[PDB]
Amino acid sequence: MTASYLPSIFVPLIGLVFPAITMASLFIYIEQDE
Amino acid sequence: GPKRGSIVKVLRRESYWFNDTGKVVAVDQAPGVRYPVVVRFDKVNYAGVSTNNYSPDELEAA
Amino acid sequence: SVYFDLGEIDNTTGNWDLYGNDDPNRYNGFQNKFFETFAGAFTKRGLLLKFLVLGGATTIGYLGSTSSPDLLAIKNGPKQVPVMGPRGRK
Amino acid sequence: AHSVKIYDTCIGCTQCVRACPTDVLEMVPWDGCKASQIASAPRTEDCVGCKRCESACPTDFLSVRVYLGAETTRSMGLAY
Amino acid sequence: MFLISWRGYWQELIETLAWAHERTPLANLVRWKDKPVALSIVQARLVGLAHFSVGYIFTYAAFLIASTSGKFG
Amino acid sequence: KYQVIEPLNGDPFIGGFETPVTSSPLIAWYLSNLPAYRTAVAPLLRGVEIGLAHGYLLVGPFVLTGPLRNSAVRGEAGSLAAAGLVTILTMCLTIYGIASFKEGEPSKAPSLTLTGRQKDADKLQTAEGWASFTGGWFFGGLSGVAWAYILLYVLNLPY
Amino acid sequence: EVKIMVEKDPVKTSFEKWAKPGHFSRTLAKGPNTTTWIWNLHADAHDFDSHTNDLEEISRKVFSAHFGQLAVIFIWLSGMYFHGARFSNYEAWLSDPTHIKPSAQVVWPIVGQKILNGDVGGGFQGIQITSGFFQLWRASGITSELQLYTTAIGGLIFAALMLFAGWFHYHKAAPKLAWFQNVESMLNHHLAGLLGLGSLAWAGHQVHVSLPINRLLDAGVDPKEIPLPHEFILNRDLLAQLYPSFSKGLTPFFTLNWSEYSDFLTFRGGLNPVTGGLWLTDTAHHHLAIAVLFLVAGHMYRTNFGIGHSMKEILEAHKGPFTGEGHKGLYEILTTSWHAQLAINLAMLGSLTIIVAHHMYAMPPYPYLATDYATQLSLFTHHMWIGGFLVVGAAAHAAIFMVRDYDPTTQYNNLLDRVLRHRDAIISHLNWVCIFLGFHSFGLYIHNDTMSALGRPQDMFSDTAIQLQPVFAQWIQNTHALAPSLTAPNATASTSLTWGGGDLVAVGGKVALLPIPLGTADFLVHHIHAFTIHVTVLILLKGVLFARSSRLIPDKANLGFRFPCDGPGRGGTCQVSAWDHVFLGLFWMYNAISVVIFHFSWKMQSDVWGSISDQGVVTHITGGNFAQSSITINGWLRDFLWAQASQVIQSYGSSLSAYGLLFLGAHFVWAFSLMFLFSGRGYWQELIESIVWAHNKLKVAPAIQPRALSIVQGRAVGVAHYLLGGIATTWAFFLARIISVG
Amino acid sequence: TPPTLNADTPAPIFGGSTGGLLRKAQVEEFYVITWESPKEQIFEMPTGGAAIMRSGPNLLKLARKEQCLALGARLRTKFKIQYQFYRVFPNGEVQYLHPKDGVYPEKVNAGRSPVGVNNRSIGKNANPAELKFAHKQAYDL
Numbered sequence A: 001m002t003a004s005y006l007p008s009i010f011v012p013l014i015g016l017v018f019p020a021i022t023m024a025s026l027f028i029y030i031e032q033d034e
Numbered sequence B: 001g002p003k004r005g006s007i008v009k010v011l012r013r014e015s016y017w018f019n020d021t022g023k024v025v026a027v028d029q030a031p032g033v034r035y036p037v038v039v040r041f042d043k044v045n046y047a048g049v050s051t052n053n054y055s056p057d058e059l060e061a062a
Numbered sequence C: 001s002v003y004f005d006l007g008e009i010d011n012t013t014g015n016w017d018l019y020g021n022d023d024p025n026r027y028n029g030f031q032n033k034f035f036e037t038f039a040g041a042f043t044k045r046g047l048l049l050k051f052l053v054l055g056g057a058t059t060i061g062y063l064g065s066t067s068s069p070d071l072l073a074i075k076n077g078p079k080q081v082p083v084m085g086p087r088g089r090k
Numbered sequence D: 001a002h003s004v005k006i007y008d009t010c011i012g013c014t015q016c017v018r019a020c021p022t023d024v025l026e027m028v029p030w031d032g033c034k035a036s037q038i039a040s041a042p043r044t045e046d047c048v049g050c051k052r053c054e055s056a057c058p059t060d061f062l063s064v065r066v067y068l069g070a071e072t073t074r075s076m077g078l079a080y
Numbered sequence E: 001m002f003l004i005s006w007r008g009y010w011q012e013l014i015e016t017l018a019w020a021h022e023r024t025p026l027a028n029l030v031r032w033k034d035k036p037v038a039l040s041i042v043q044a045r046l047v048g049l050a051h052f053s054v055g056y057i058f059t060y061a062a063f064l065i066a067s068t069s070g071k072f073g
Numbered sequence F: 001k002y003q004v005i006e007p008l009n010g011d012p013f014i015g016g017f018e019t020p021v022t023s024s025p026l027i028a029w030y031l032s033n034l035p036a037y038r039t040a041v042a043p044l045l046r047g048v049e050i051g052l053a054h055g056y057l058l059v060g061p062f063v064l065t066g067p068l069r070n071s072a073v074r075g076e077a078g079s080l081a082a083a084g085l086v087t088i089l090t091m092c093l094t095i096y097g098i099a100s101f102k103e104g105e106p107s108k109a110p111s112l113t114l115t116g117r118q119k120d121a122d123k124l125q126t127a128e129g130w131a132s133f134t135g136g137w138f139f140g141g142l143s144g145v146a147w148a149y150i151l152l153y154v155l156n157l158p159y
Numbered sequence G: 001e002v003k004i005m006v007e008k009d010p011v012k013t014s015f016e017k018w019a020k021p022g023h024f025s026r027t028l029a030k031g032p033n034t035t036t037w038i039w040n041l042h043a044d045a046h047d048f049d050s051h052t053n054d055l056e057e058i059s060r061k062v063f064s065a066h067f068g069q070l071a072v073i074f075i076w077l078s079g080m081y082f083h084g085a086r087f088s089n090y091e092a093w094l095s096d097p098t099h100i101k102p103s104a105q106v107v108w109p110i111v112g113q114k115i116l117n118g119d120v121g122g123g124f125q126g127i128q129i130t131s132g133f134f135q136l137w138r139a140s141g142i143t144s145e146l147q148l149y150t151t152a153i154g155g156l157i158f159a160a161l162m163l164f165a166g167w168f169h170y171h172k173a174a175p176k177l178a179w180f181q182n183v184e185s186m187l188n189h190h191l192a193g194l195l196g197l198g199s200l201a202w203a204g205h206q207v208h209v210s211l212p213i214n215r216l217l218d219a220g221v222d223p224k225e226i227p228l229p230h231e232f233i234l235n236r237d238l239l240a241q242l243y244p245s246f247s248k249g250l251t252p253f254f255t256l257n258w259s260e261y262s263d264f265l266t267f268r269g270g271l272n273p274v275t276g277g278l279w280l281t282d283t284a285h286h287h288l289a290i291a292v293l294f295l296v297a298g299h300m301y302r303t304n305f306g307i308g309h310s311m312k313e314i315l316e317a318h319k320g321p322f323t324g325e326g327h328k329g330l331y332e333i334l335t336t337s338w339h340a341q342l343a344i345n346l347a348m349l350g351s352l353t354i355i356v357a358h359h360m361y362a363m364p365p366y367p368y369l370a371t372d373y374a375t376q377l378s379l380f381t382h383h384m385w386i387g388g389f390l391v392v393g394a395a396a397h398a399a400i401f402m403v404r405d406y407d408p409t410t411q412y413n414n415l416l417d418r419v420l421r422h423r424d425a426i427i428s429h430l431n432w433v434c435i436f437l438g439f440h441s442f443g444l445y446i447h448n449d450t451m452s453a454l455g456r457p458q459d460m461f462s463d464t465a466i467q468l469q470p471v472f473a474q475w476i477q478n479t480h481a482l483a484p485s486l487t488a489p490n491a492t493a494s495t496s497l498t499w500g501g502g503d504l505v506a507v508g509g510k511v512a513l514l515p516i517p518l519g520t521a522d523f524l525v526h527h528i529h530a531f532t533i534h535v536t537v538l539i540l541l542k543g544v545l546f547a548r549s550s551r552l553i554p555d556k557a558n559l560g561f562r563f564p565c566d567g568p569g570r571g572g573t574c575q576v577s578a579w580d581h582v583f584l585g586l587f588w589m590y591n592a593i594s595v596v597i598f599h600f601s602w603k604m605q606s607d608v609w610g611s612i613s614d615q616g617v618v619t620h621i622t623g624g625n626f627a628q629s630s631i632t633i634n635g636w637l638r639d640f641l642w643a644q645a646s647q648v649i650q651s652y653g654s655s656l657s658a659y660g661l662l663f664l665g666a667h668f669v670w671a672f673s674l675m676f677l678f679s680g681r682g683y684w685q686e687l688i689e690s691i692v693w694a695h696n697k698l699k700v701a702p703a704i705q706p707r708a709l710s711i712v713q714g715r716a717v718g719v720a721h722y723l724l725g726g727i728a729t730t731w732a733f734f735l736a737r738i739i740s741v742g
Numbered sequence H: 001t002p003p004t005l006n007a008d009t010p011a012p013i014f015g016g017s018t019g020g021l022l023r024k025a026q027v028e029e030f031y032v033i034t035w036e037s038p039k040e041q042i043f044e045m046p047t048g049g050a051a052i053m054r055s056g057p058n059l060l061k062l063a064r065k066e067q068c069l070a071l072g073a074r075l076r077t078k079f080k081i082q083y084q085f086y087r088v089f090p091n092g093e094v095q096y097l098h099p100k101d102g103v104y105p106e107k108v109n110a111g112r113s114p115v116g117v118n119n120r121s122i123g124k125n126a127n128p129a130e131l132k133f134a135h136k137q138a139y140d141l
């Protein structure tokens, strides 16, 4: 592995932050009456 | 319509007794009845009833 | 003796607040002033959600990247020899 | 919001309206079967889908048919 | 769980769970928007089939890979 | 003392009872004097108090039983986990406030007392009220976690 | 007031109602139009309160059915005794109870099944039984096949007698409703007469025949040289040779100087050191005390002799502030409804069966019982299953009562009304505690599994890592271990060897009992037991309370106790009756009892049983791997299922082959249950039409139209096949394991 | 017929219950049922428990419509008591529902219109494959 510092950057940014923000966005879109 | 005690075979496509025979009981002879013929069958349906009324053009085979 | 009315409709639907303390002030005015001048800008939810997401992102970034070798087990890597393949593989 | 229908085979048994536990089906004057009676569903906005109506009509297949449609609070039978 | 037990039990359970949530202090400040109801009938069948299928696939993929690759024939 | 069970507000057609647990002088006093039920006080102060309490209590189950509960960084990892939990809860509170509250509605809170007095609804059930509550809770939680860590792993008086 | 009431010849015995198959109910007495008549005939064949409406005929039918059931039980018992007499190696077993496997069944050689007659020892060949009848007969003093033959005949006689009574009290002299309602005299006679005199008679038999014969059997004499059980009755001197207290005659009992009966009326804990069972000199004293207890307790309730209590003034007198009008109107419930009595009786009898199953394994009452591991395991599992079934039956019958016997016009008596009026609270709190228990019990196992999978065992919940030692059970054990010195000065030893006190006892190799340790692995499984029991109570109590009405269906009591669903409306209302709650609770009862029996099996094979050698070294069967390997589900998968299931699977070609066959048979039945549990009536009813078409095409259409099983019979069949398959699988596995390795 | 008007009649005696009104009754509709009795009996509540109705007029408010119809059918069958029930909105707008024209929906009555009545046999509806890209379903025709 060349970088070897990217897996420590991405899986925290894809298994923790990505769901945390997309679930919030989708919850705002679901629970709205427009 | 048909005679009393006559054995007629059904043609109603959505009938439990389709293509089955039954003997008329008493056809009502009122002026504005849409299904006057009354026929009783010797085998109940899924609901359990054996008598049903049809129109004269809806069942005849003799 | 009667439990219905169209005027006082809230009496006949159970809209009472069973525990209401109407006290307008409970804490020290100085302490309240020193608490609202510091936790006041945090009121803007539009400018708080986008603050929290970036704070958490950068936090799990710096902590995920600038970790320690002794703390983590996936960061300390293997410090032994690897086992061999059951069919003479490696 | 379910759709009730009464086809022209009701012999006026009056059982459909006796069975419906929501005051949805009612009798109506309509000459043609024996007694100038027929069923009528004016209050379909209250049917929950109980299908007690269909379980009562002693017709060949059926004369009152319930079609489950859009769901609401009244039709879901909710009390909360 | 989704194939043996059917809806009329779970709805009558949710109807008292909602009561318990409404009649408690310090927790009736929050409030649901969508009324909680039990899963539908065809929906329950679908979820049950999905669980059955995912489990059926996984517990055999794991076995076929472990028992073979652990010996390599 | 004769018969301690009663319907709510003396109305039998509501879903509950006035048991000694729900309705009682000591219980009603203790429950009315809680920051979430004090009505007239500004939402920001209640949020600050509640966040302080929760962030202060949360440091326990994180430091004593963690994945690094046996290292020199014993307390720091638990304090960081507590701060993470409070910011996550702040985010959940924010999205709840956005989804459940509008910027034009007057109030969803109850307005009457136990005896039908025409009081005023709680300002917490407004959009800006919940925003202030969320900000105050964020601040209180962070400050409480920090104070707990200061008292535990900087000073004396072990437990 | 209380008197005999009989109506002479209320029903002429004949064969008329016998030729008409459906006769009890008029709805199906007409004839089988469709094939859903054969089914509901047997369904409501025993629904006595559904055929008619008067309590009198219902009570008479109940009485006669009880008599028939007693006759069947008597036939069963006489058959077991006759088999022990004719096809058993009992006399050979008596000469060497530690090397001869019990067996009382032989198989005809027809199709190669001859190999089921395994070599059990003593020159015999037959299936090895596990009923524990040999130990019971050895403890009773039975020492010859003759003494079995006779009693077999005896049983048969009683059978006929019972049948006669069953006919008599329905056809010649049947009582009337006013006679059954005398519950005061009924309880008086069941306390003083049935239990008291029964215990006194058994204490007499013990103290006269069972004590000397068993003592001479412990002294190592030949079971043929032992005098017959009447040589100790017509010779007080021949009996006093062992217990010289008999030389003092019946005088100590009448002068209150009976502290000299300490020879045969003892108070000594522990087990007999040579038989691994209780001291019969102790059980005789126990029965003698229980008899007088029940006798003096059988004088409480009032009859026509002036004195005594009345169980209506007792009830109304208990009426507190919190609980409305007290127990008023409950004496009217339990004397005008057979279901409200069956519920309580079934609940108490099931709980009592569980208590029995827990007591017998810990205090073996029969000689050489703790040694034979197969018998001690079967007697636990069987009784556990029986109790688990009876409690669910109690729930079902309470629901039935609530559905069609309860009425409010008299039940303004605010005890049942008050608990009916906060069901939405009772069930809510039971649901919350069920969730809490489920999490804090099973999530711990999942934690341990994930940790042991992530190569970090130091973070587990083991006995080396974070500990969960149950301190209260350990304190109770230490308290009962010291009782014979402080809190029981006359008892020589503790009541059981399972308490931490005491030591080990051997029966010639294999160990009988020893102090049982309790660690975290026991904490977890006890909390799991609590969780499953709580979920079962949740389901059953929810059904019972919402049997009448709910927010979903306010008029459910009009629909009845047993009905599939109220339409696909309201989102869906499938499985909404109380019958469906019993259907759902049967599975959780099965789960709970299966977990209990797995717990018992593994813990006993791991920390109790074994075979000690000289110098004291004791090696248990599995090797004490329960404290460490039972904290993870993988451990229960390999160390219990995979490991112990290695005896049944490879039992082909041996005397244990039938267990290996019934393993797969029960697996098939269990999997077969899923076809009914998952599917629904509409698909099968439609499919049947395409077969009726092929039949009509060839003029083989039956006159009884083939309808598919009702929506409730499908569920009944599914749960029945499920339970049969599961229990039979566990039966085969347990027996094929313990017979070979125990 | 002029629909009967609500009043402030008393309520049946009841010690309470946990199966009463909920928040749905203050943000949405709720129902109330009345009747007249000649004595004081004990009647079973459709929400669990028993209550003693009072002589003369009685008024009871519930949470659904099916509850009112269940209680009313039980009354009309066991006690021979006639009844009505209404639906009340949050803003106090009473709406009269059950005996809409005085006569219960079982007995025929003049001045009643037929709704949802199709002039054909149920087995005559057209297939759902001709009325595609046309929101007429199969039966509204």
Ligand code: CLA
Pocket: A006, A007, A008, A010, A011, A014
């Ligand atoms: C669908 C294809 C695919 C899949 C399943 C994965 C899976 C994975 N990648 Mg990855 N990757 C991919 C394509 C893919 N990669 C491509 C094309 C690139 C080049 C840009 C990379 C570059 C990359 C890096 C640099 C790293 C990973 C890493 C990882 C692992 C952790 C997840 C993560 O951080 O992702 C992060 C993913 C990205 C930064 C880029 C995403 C790539 C494409 C655009 C996503 C494909 C979209 C997808 C089809 C839509 C999904 C729909 C679904 C939700 C229904 C995981 C095994 C990490 C690792 O090795 O950890 C051990 C890591 O450090 N990936």
Ligand code: CLA
Pocket: F061, F062, F065, F066, F067, G439, G440, G441, G442, G443, G444, G446, G447, G450, G459
């Ligand atoms: C309910 C079951 C359960 C329990 C008790 C635990 C417990 C634990 N797990 Mg765990 N785990 C579980 C299931 C469970 N696990 C499952 C199912 C999985 C797989 C998905 C895992 C996977 C897992 C991992 C991967 C890890 C753990 C770890 C841990 C430890 C620290 C966790 C932590 O920070 O908690 C913090 C707890 C809190 C923030 C809340 C505490 C709850 C409070 C005290 C409730 C108080 C209520 C109060 C008394 C009510 C009264 C109020 C009144 C005063 C007014 C701890 C021993 C970690 C470890 O290393 O352990 C050594 C770790 O890395 N777990």
Ligand code: CLA
Pocket: G011, G012, G013, G014, G015, G016, G017, G018, G019, G023, G024, G060, G061, G062, G064, G065, G067, G068, G072, G163, G164, G165, G166, G167, G170
């Ligand atoms: C002497 C012979 C005799 C005769 C001619 C009759 C005749 C009659 N009895 Mg009667 N009865 C008898 C003996 C007899 N009884 C005895 C000995 C008992 C005591 C158990 C009863 C108890 C009894 C009751 C309680 C009732 C009758 C009733 C009746 C009438 C209808 C019976 C009927 O059609 O069901 C025929 C029923 C059967 C053939 C079923 C027999 C099943 C037996 C009893 C149990 C066998 C169990 C066996 C071990 C199998 C177990 C499972 C196995 C598959 C493994 C009829 C007048 C009924 C009546 O009059 O009500 C209107 C009624 O309610 N009888």
Ligand code: CLA
Pocket: G042, G043, G044, G045, G046, G047, G048, G346, G389, G390, G391, G392, G393, G394, G396, G400, G561, G562, G579, G582, G720, G724
């Ligand atoms: C003291 C014991 C006792 C008594 C007297 C009764 C009596 C009664 N029960 Mg009941 N019940 C009991 C225990 C008891 N039960 C237990 C323990 C349970 C829990 C499982 C139930 C669950 C239960 C339900 C769910 C229902 C009843 C019903 C009834 C009534 C009609 C029963 C009937 O006609 O069955 C006729 C008998 C049969 C159709 C036999 C069925 C065959 C069984 C299921 C299989 C046996 C398997 C066998 C052991 C081995 C299989 C292999 C072999 C066959 C080859 C009757 C009053 C019904 C009712 O409506 O009450 C009014 C009803 O719906 N009971």
Ligand code: CLA
Pocket: E001, E002, E004, E005, G431, G434, G435, G436, G437, G438, G439, G442, G443, G446, G535, G538, G539, G584, G587, G588
């Ligand atoms: C293995 C299968 C299975 C499982 C897990 C369950 C689970 C449950 N059943 Mg159940 N059930 C099943 C089969 C199963 N059932 C079957 C086959 C039937 C037919 C007879 C029933 C019939 C039935 C009835 C009739 C009832 C239940 C009830 C319950 C609940 C009891 C509450 C509890 O203990 O919560 C504990 C929950 C668990 C232990 C599930 C695992 C949770 C893990 C450990 C935590 C994971 C951590 C985290 C959340 C993961 C996040 C993932 C994310 C990051 C992606 C629970 C949800 C009762 C109920 O509703 O009570 C509330 C109830 O009344 N069930």
